Amino acid sequence: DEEILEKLRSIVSVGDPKKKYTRFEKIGQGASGTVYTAMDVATGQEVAIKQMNLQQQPKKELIINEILVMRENKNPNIVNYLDSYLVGDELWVVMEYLAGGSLTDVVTETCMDEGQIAAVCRECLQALEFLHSNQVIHRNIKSDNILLGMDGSVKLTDFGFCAQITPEQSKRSEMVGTPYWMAPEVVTRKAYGPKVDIWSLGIMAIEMIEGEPPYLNENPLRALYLIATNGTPELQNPEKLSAIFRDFLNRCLEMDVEKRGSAKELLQHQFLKIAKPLSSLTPLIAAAKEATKNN
Ligand SMILES: N#CC1(C(=O)N[C@]23C[C@](Nc4cncc(Nc5ncc(C6CC6)s5)n4)(C2)C3)CNC1
């Protein structure tokens, strides 16, 4: 549909971003595109720019949807959308820069304590409570999509996979996500709702405990099969966790969706009573940056 393409072309700003920004440094490179920091020639502001190759995404309505959801759902625990450009066959999305980097680096290079985990979970649940109240389901919660500020701020990004629900159509049915983090109702193609995000948050808490989601060593298709057959995953060493942390995990990773916590309910879970102030996260940031400086 050259209808879709024309809507994309009219959403973006015009001008050359290679002259509106400068000092490009590559900081990441997924299949979803390459990420650079840069500086706004006009403002001084540091920004993150995500370069997304269009020919990779045949369903352009997903790109539109990403930008539209981001601009419409502003929140302190969500990375801010700034602007977008079309540079030939690539879309550039300009976002606020968080200099503390990804929770992925923290969970792979450090051992978080329960108080720090509680703090991260509480900020993530705040983001989810906001989204879900606005009838938005993220569908791609994972450590990779949590960014940290140098003050210990915690923010969600990546609306590339999200869905909007209504009272008329309250459930989705697309098998979308990143396998290791996907709820069993999504993997097995049942109708599902916002609590799929809660499941994925539970898997992210397992990342913070163990360094990886369950089954990361397996290929993605095998991981889907394991999720379909095991349901609620097992920890390598459950006994090292507090009872209240175990209770929280169990409520996030309940097989029965009615029983699984909502974000609003999980914000009042006993485990969050031990959350530390966000300043407690700045040492993890320092450690992660030290560990990854020489990659
Ligand atoms: N998965 C994935 C992709 C990716 O590369 N994501 C990345 C987080 C990265 N690393 C760092 C490192 N130090 C700071 C920082 N800050 C940032 N603020 C704002 C940011 C923008 C993205 C909202 S990214 N990010 C860049 C790895 C592939 N496209 C998304």
UniProtKB/Swiss-Prot annotation:
<feature type="modified residue" description="Phosphothreonine; by autocatalysis, BRSK2 and PDPK1">
    <location>
        <position position="174"/>
    </location>
</feature>
<dbReference type="GO" id="GO:0106310">
    <property type="term" value="F:protein serine kinase activity"/>
</dbReference>
<dbReference type="GO" id="GO:0005518">
    <property type="term" value="F:collagen binding"/>
</dbReference>
<dbReference type="GO" id="GO:0032991">
    <property type="term" value="C:protein-containing complex"/>
</dbReference>
<dbReference type="GO" id="GO:0090314">
    <property type="term" value="P:positive regulation of protein targeting to membrane"/>
</dbReference>
<keyword id="KW-0053">Apoptosis</keyword>
<keyword id="KW-0418">Kinase</keyword>
<dbReference type="GO" id="GO:0043408">
    <property type="term" value="P:regulation of MAPK cascade"/>
</dbReference>
<dbReference type="GO" id="GO:0060244">
    <property type="term" value="P:negative regulation of cell proliferation involved in contact inhibition"/>
</dbReference>
<dbReference type="GO" id="GO:0030036">
    <property type="term" value="P:actin cytoskeleton organization"/>
</dbReference>
<dbReference type="GO" id="GO:0010763">
    <property type="term" value="P:positive regulation of fibroblast migration"/>
</dbReference>
<dbReference type="GO" id="GO:0048812">
    <property type="term" value="P:neuron projection morphogenesis"/>
</dbReference>
<dbReference type="GO" id="GO:0014704">
    <property type="term" value="C:intercalated disc"/>
</dbReference>
<comment type="function">
    <text>Protein kinase involved in intracellular signaling pathways downstream of integrins and receptor-type kinases that plays an important role in cytoskeleton dynamics, in cell adhesion, migration, proliferation, apoptosis, mitosis, and in vesicle-mediated transport processes. Can directly phosphorylate BAD and protects cells against apoptosis. Activated by interaction with CDC42 and RAC1. Functions as a GTPase effector that links the Rho-related GTPases CDC42 and RAC1 to the JNK MAP kinase pathway. Phosphorylates and activates MAP2K1, and thereby mediates activation of downstream MAP kinases.</text>
</comment>
<dbReference type="GO" id="GO:0030335">
    <property type="term" value="P:positive regulation of cell migration"/>
</dbReference>
<dbReference type="GO" id="GO:0048013">
    <property type="term" value="P:ephrin receptor signaling pathway"/>
</dbReference>
<comment type="subunit">
    <text>Homodimer; homodimerization results in autoinhibition. Active as monomer. Interacts with GIT1. Component of cytoplasmic complexes, which also contains PXN, ARHGEF7 and GIT1. Interacts with NISCH. Interacts with DVL1; mediates the formation of a DVL1, MUSK and PAK1 ternary complex involved in AChR clustering. Binds to the caspase-cleaved p110 isoform of CDC2L1 and CDC2L2, p110C, but not the full-length proteins. Interacts with ARHGEF7. Interacts tightly with GTP-bound but not GDP-bound CDC42/P21 and RAC1. Interacts with SCRIB. Interacts with PDPK1. Interacts (via kinase domain) with RAF1.</text>
</comment>
<keyword id="KW-0206">Cytoskeleton</keyword>
<dbReference type="GO" id="GO:0005884">
    <property type="term" value="C:actin filament"/>
</dbReference>
<dbReference type="GO" id="GO:0042060">
    <property type="term" value="P:wound healing"/>
</dbReference>
<dbReference type="GO" id="GO:0043015">
    <property type="term" value="F:gamma-tubulin binding"/>
</dbReference>
<keyword id="KW-0808">Transferase</keyword>
<dbReference type="GO" id="GO:1904754">
    <property type="term" value="P:positive regulation of vascular associated smooth muscle cell migration"/>
</dbReference>
<keyword id="KW-0965">Cell junction</keyword>
<dbReference type="GO" id="GO:0030018">
    <property type="term" value="C:Z disc"/>
</dbReference>
<dbReference type="GO" id="GO:0005886">
    <property type="term" value="C:plasma membrane"/>
</dbReference>
<dbReference type="GO" id="GO:0005737">
    <property type="term" value="C:cytoplasm"/>
</dbReference>
<dbReference type="GO" id="GO:0021549">
    <property type="term" value="P:cerebellum development"/>
</dbReference>
<dbReference type="GO" id="GO:0030424">
    <property type="term" value="C:axon"/>
</dbReference>
<dbReference type="GO" id="GO:0001666">
    <property type="term" value="P:response to hypoxia"/>
</dbReference>
<dbReference type="GO" id="GO:0005911">
    <property type="term" value="C:cell-cell junction"/>
</dbReference>
<keyword id="KW-0723">Serine/threonine-protein kinase</keyword>
<dbReference type="GO" id="GO:0004674">
    <property type="term" value="F:protein serine/threonine kinase activity"/>
</dbReference>
<dbReference type="GO" id="GO:0005524">
    <property type="term" value="F:ATP binding"/>
</dbReference>
<dbReference type="GO" id="GO:0005694">
    <property type="term" value="C:chromosome"/>
</dbReference>
<feature type="active site" description="Proton acceptor">
    <location>
        <position position="140"/>
    </location>
</feature>
<dbReference type="GO" id="GO:0032869">
    <property type="term" value="P:cellular response to insulin stimulus"/>
</dbReference>
<dbReference type="GO" id="GO:0030425">
    <property type="term" value="C:dendrite"/>
</dbReference>
<dbReference type="GO" id="GO:0006338">
    <property type="term" value="P:chromatin remodeling"/>
</dbReference>
<comment type="similarity">
    <text>Belongs to the protein kinase superfamily. STE Ser/Thr protein kinase family. STE20 subfamily.</text>
</comment>
<dbReference type="GO" id="GO:0005813">
    <property type="term" value="C:centrosome"/>
</dbReference>
<dbReference type="GO" id="GO:0004672">
    <property type="term" value="F:protein kinase activity"/>
</dbReference>
